[PDB]
Design a binder for this molecule. Structure first.
Ligand code: CL
Ligand code: CL
Lengths: 68, 68
């Protein structure tokens, strides 16, 4: 948790069509995306270990995302 | 799209327990999180306009996340 920088998150909300954005909404969306990222990456670690690898690959992320 | 920097995404996957991460998995998870962020923020813009505001607030992000 707390990995994403806040300035890029406000650009996500502006690019989605917001006129103005509070810094409290940037912190809220960063928390949602870091939680979703942790859930998908923990499934991807298990998929890589099931495949016999130590490296997480794109295919592990794509398959993990389909579990959600 | 393309708002999130790639280095913080690799920290999400390492913090979730990966030993090693390919730069192709960092690009893949960034794409997933930017898509989810756009969907949640577009719903939050509609909630703010329904409330009569031009500013997106934390409560708009939290309510939008419950629609997913
Ligand atoms: Cl490996
Ligand atoms: Cl306002």
């Amino acid at each position: 948790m707390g990995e994403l920088p806040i300035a890029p998150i406000g650009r996500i909300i502006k690019n989605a069509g917001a006129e103005r954005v509070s810094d409290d909404a940037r912190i809220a969306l960063a928390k949602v995306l870091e939680e979703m990222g942790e859930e998908i990456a923990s499934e991807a670690v298990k998929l890589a270990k099931h495949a016999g690898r130590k490296t997480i690959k794109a295919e592990d992320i794509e398959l993990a995302r389909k579990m959600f």
